[PDB]
Design a binder for this molecule. Sequence first.
Ligand SMILES: Nc1nc2cc(O)ccc2[nH]1
Length: 245
Amino acid sequence: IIGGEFTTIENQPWFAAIYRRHRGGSVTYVCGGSLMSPCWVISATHCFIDYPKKEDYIVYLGRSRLNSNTQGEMKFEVENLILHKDYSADTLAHHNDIALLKIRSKEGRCAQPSRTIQTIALPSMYNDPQFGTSCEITGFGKENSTDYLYPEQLKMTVVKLISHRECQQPHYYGSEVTTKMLCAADPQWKTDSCQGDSGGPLVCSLQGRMTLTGIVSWGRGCALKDKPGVYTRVSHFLPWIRSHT
Ligand SMILES: Nc1nc2cc(O)ccc2[nH]1
């Protein structure tokens, strides 16, 4: 993340760090995601679609830093990884970018909702906070685009929400965000998401409740005058999310 602050997990008690295991050479960070209910995490197919053998991922909850074992984490396999039956990578733009992972400790069970391990609620149907709401993102994403290492502490930032007519400024993303893709960014240029963040959460405040408003997906550069980060628009997906759940 190219924005504000370094945080710790208990301000993010739903974050999901997902790792690939390798043939021999060990384990590299895939993406974030978010804890749904002790059996489930939510993220984006673009992360896994090239490499779909559920058995190579190792996701974590309660982990606070890329390569250090933080206080009281729990480790996970992924009993099933479910990718959207319809996904597509158009130039820059991603489509129906959503995915589910059923975790399972080495023991067969979903996770124990600790202090450092909460669910976050899904949105309700046709109710997304309005342009100009500040929401927040978490990930271990590049700090600077020019960087080729992801940061070693976790990062969080907050980011204002854009309206589809504004984000379809042809000076922005044209007809390529669409009704199910949600733009947001800090009034231009300075904080934003980036690489290896997608699958992270966009968590807006609705009535009182932190609510999984959107899932990070794409954006042309990180922190660019006229280039919003776009985030999947979660309420358009609550059917699929229950009928593959
Ligand atoms: N603005 C923005 N650029 C991004 C690039 C990514 O690979 C993932 C999220 C992003 N958000």
